[PDB]
Design a protein around this ligand. Structure first.
Ligand code: SF4
Length: 181
């Protein structure tokens, strides 16, 4: 669909369907005009999964890395992004990451936005985000209980149900949310 493009992915109509990890990656990208490696990978493969074309992805990434010149973007990042679309080397059209894959990556440190917020954020940070999403105190306690147990995809599924099958892939969360929209 032509509805998913370099500009629409920043709009509320599309972004309201993102799970917490993708919202966190978009926030880091908008604040810093950049993402570190694992965040570039997690977000670019998710956007490929929602239908962002290779041409639109290059527009998205070059526009989002707003503070560098197009020549620096082309020298330093274009190959990596094209490679994610199966346009380089062996031309493997890499699949988007599921939660299992996301969780397997090195844990995020200072300045990183990849990973899973249900594992990576403090209960203080999660509670504030869930309050902003209109969840009640009882609902927040239920989500945090799943987090404490290490059941991140269950916490994420609870947030999906509370804000709208077990979800264990950010692209499935997006697709299910978009179909209900
Ligand atoms: S459980 Fe999966 S889709 Fe949900 S925020 Fe974590 S990594 Fe993203």
């Amino acid at each position: 669909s032509d509805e998913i493009n370099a500009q629409s992915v920043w709009s509320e109509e599309i972004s309201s369907n993102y799970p917490l990890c993708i919202k966190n990656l978009m926030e880091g990208l908008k604040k810093n005009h950049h993402l570190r490696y694992y965040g570039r990978q997690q977000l670019s493969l998710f956007l490929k999964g929602i239908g962002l074309s290779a041409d639109e992805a290059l527009k998205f990434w070059s526009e989002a890395f707003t503070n560098m010149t197009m020549e620096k973007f082309n020298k330093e990042y274009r190959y990596s992004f094209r490679h994610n679309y199966g346009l380089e080397g062996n031309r493997i059209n890499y699949k988007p990451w599921d939660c299992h894959t996301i969780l397997s990556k090195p844990r995020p440190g200072r300045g990183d936005y990849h990973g899973c917020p249900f594992r990576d954020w403090s209960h203080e940070r999660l509670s504030a985000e869930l309050r902003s999403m209109k969840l009640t105190q009882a609902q927040i306690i239920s989500v945090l209980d799943s987090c404490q147990k290490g059941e991140y995809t269950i916490a994420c599924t609870k947030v999906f149900e509370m804000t709208h099958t077990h979800i264990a892939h950010p692209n499935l969360y997006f697709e299910r949310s978009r179909q209900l929209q």
